[PDB]
Amino acid sequence: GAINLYSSRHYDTDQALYDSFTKKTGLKVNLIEGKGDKLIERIKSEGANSPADVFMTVDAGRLWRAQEAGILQPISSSTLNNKIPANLRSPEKLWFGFSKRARVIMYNKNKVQPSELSTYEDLAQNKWKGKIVIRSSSNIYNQSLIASLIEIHGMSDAEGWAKGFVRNFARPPEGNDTAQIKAVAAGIGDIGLANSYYLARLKRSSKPEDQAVADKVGMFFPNQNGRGTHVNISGGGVVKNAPNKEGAIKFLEYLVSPEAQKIFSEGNNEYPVVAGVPIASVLKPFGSFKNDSTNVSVYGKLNADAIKLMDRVGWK
Ligand SMILES: [Cl-]
Numbered sequence: 001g002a003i004n005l006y007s008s009r010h011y012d013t014d015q016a017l018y019d020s021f022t023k024k025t026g027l028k029v030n031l032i033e034g035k036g037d038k039l040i041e042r043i044k045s046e047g048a049n050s051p052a053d054v055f056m057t058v059d060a061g062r063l064w065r066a067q068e069a070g071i072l073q074p075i076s077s078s079t080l081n082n083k084i085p086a087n088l089r090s091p092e093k094l095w096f097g098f099s100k101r102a103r104v105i106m107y108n109k110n111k112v113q114p115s116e117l118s119t120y121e122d123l124a125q126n127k128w129k130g131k132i133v134i135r136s137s138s139n140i141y142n143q144s145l146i147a148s149l150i151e152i153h154g155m156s157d158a159e160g161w162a163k164g165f166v167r168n169f170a171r172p173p174e175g176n177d178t179a180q181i182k183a184v185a186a187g188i189g190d191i192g193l194a195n196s197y198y199l200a201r202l203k204r205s206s207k208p209e210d211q212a213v214a215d216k217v218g219m220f221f222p223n224q225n226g227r228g229t230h231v232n233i234s235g236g237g238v239v240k241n242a243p244n245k246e247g248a249i250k251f252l253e254y255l256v257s258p259e260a261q262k263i264f265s266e267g268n269n270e271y272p273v274v275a276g277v278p279i280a281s282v283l284k285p286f287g288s289f290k291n292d293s294t295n296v297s298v299y300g301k302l303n304a305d306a307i308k309l310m311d312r313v314g315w316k
Contacts, residue, residue, distance in 0.1 A: 001026070001027055001028070001244055001247060002027055002028035002029070002030055002244065002247070003027055003028070003029055003030070003053040003054060003244050003247040003248055003251055004030045004032060004051045004052050004053045004054070004243075004244075005018075005029050005030065005031050005032065005053065005054045005056065005251070006032045006034070006039050006042070006043060006052045006054065006055050006056070006239070007031065007032070007033060007039075007054075007055070007056040007057070007236070008033070008034060008035055008036035008038075008039055008056070008057045008058065009036075009056045009057055009058055009234050009236075009268070010031060010033055010056075011267040011268055013263065013266070013267040014263065014264065014267050016263055017255075017259075017260050017263045017264055018031070020254075020259065020260070020263075021250075021251060021254050021260075024254065025247070025250050025251075025254070027244075027247045027250065027251070029251070032052070036057035036058060036059075036062050037062065037065075039055065039057065040055075040057075040062075040065060040066050040069055040071060043055060043066075043069075043071045043239060044069050044070075044071055047241075048241055050239060050240075050241055051243060052071075052239040052241075052242065053238065053239055053242040053243065053244050053245070053247060053248040053251075054236055054237070054238060054239065054242070054248045054251055054252065055071065055072065055236055055237055055239050056098075056234070056235065056236035057234070057235070057236070058101075058140075058232075058233070058234045058235075059140045059141060059144055059232055059233070059299075060095075060097075060144060060232055060233055060235070060296035060297060060299045060300055061140045061143055061144045061147070061232075061299050061300045061303045062140055062300075063090070063094075063095040063233070063235055063236075063237070063300065064297060064299070064300020064301065064303065065300065065303070066094075066095065066237070067090065067092070067094045067095060067237075067300075068300075070240065071239055071240050072094040072095060072237040072238065072239065072240060073094070073237075073238050073239070073240045073242070073245075074092055074093040074094050075093055075096075075237070075238050075249055075252065076093060077249060077252070077253060079253045079256060080096055080252060080253060080256065083256040083273075083274050083275075084096050084097060084098075084256060084273050084274070085097075085273060085275075086295070087231075087291075087292075087293050087294060087295050087296060088100065088231075088233050088235075088273050088296060089235075090237075090297055091295060091297055094237050095235050095236060095237035096235055096236065096237060096252060097233030097234065097235040097273050097296065098233070098234055098235055098236065098252075098255045098256070098261075098264055098265075098273060099233065099234040099261075099264055099265040099268065099270035099271060099272060099273060100231050100232070100233060100234075100265075100270055100271040100272070100273050100291075101195045101196055101197055101231065101232050101233070101234070101270050101271070102195065102196040102221060102229050102230065102231050102232075102271075102289070102291075103141060103144075103145045103193055103194070103195055103196075103229075103230045103231075103232065104193070104194065104195070104196050104219045104220060104221055104222065104229065105117055105123075105191050105192070105193060105219065105220040105222055106180065106181050106184050106191065106192045106193070106194050106199060106217050106218070106219055106220075107184065107190065107191045107192075107217065107218050107219070107220055108184050108185065108187065108189075108190050108191070108216060108217060109216060109217065109218045110216070111187070111190045112190050112191060112218075114218070114220055117191075117220045117222065118222065118223075118225070119222050119223045119226065120145075120149065120222050120223060120230070121161060123164075123165055123168065123191070123193075124160075124161045124162075124163075124164030124165045124167075124168070125164065126164075126168075128168040128190075128191065129167065129168050130168070130170050131168060131170055131189055131190040131191060132165070132168040132169055132170055132189055132190075132191055132192060132193075133169070133170050133171065133180045133183045133184060133188060133189035133191075133192040134169070134173060134180060134192055134193045135173050135174075135175060135176055135177060135179070135180060135194075136173040136315075136316060137173070137307065137310035137311070137315045137316060139176075139177075141177070141195055141232065142193070142306075142310070143299075143303050143306045143307060143310075144230075144232055144296075144299035144300075144303070144306070145193070145230055145299075146158070146162070146306040146309060146310060147298065147299040147300075147301070147302035147303055147305065147306040148230055148292070148294060148298065148299055148302075149161060149162075150302050150305050150306060150309060151294065151298050151302055152227070155305065155309065158309060159309055159312065159313060162309055162310065162313045162315065163313050165313075165315075166313050166314055166315050170183075170188055170189040170190075171183075171188060171189075172316050173315070173316045177194035177195055177198045178194070178198050178201070178202070180192040180193070180194050181194055181198055181199060181202065181213060181217050182213050184216075184217050185212070185213040185216040185217050195232075196219060196269075196270075196271075196283070196286075197268055197269040197270050199214060199217060199219050200269035200280070200282040200283060201268075201269055202214040202217075203282055204269070204282055219286055221286075221287075221289035221290075223290075223292070224289060224290050227292050227293075227294075228289070228290035228291050228292035228293070229289050229290060229291055229292060230292055231291045231292065231296070232296055232299065233273070233296055234264075234268065234270060236252065236255075237252075238252065256273070256274050258274065258276070258277050261273070261274045261277040262277060262278065265277070265280065266280045269282055269283065271283065
């Protein structure tokens, strides 16, 4: 038989994972690609007629939106629950993380030493005036990080932080996460926020200009002396009306195997979720880091609050 995998998270190296799955289970993987938000809308519009078995995307904020659209069904699996850390899966078992990213401080190594960095909260301090670059508030990764800060601090204390943070922008938000790393390399900012895997992607590039940017920029995992670094997921779930629910479950279970964890995580320079699986060579030089134990569903729950806060403080 077969499963229909609707994914915004596919890389071509994942074909090896699909082929291994098929060898192990007999199930073919039919891949349907699209942007994550577009795939949610697609599955919603397909309704009860949808062939989708598995939905995969990035960011718990987006997985939460999927869940609230009613397109997922809950799955109880010993294998998923044992192998996936509780903080990286939906409390309601609607979706599950399969690789992990961190939203980190990217810094210009010539201008900034790691001893100068500490927490997310410290980024609102006046010493950083004119020195921070970050992308738009319309980006989900930012929404999820600010949601986490609202959960910790409450709206009033988080708004105080955000006002200071925005005050420190070197320029109006412009470009994607990679653009922020480039701006840090070029001296437009001294620090920026971006996901871990974008630095690794530059490190691995064959383009000399990308390598030169990676040579100039370090990454710092914040809040190590306190709650830990903000982590988020690439993840997925079984679709509400899946025509092959058993096969869908088998696929999710296969993704937590050590083989699949390596292939899937390394395909986008992300970290495994499963304990004991070795980390990608490109990530090792940055070291291990304490992860916050907050359940990542919170970042979806508070997504609208994050958007509102960012609007209120003038984060463009
Ligand atoms: Cl929590």
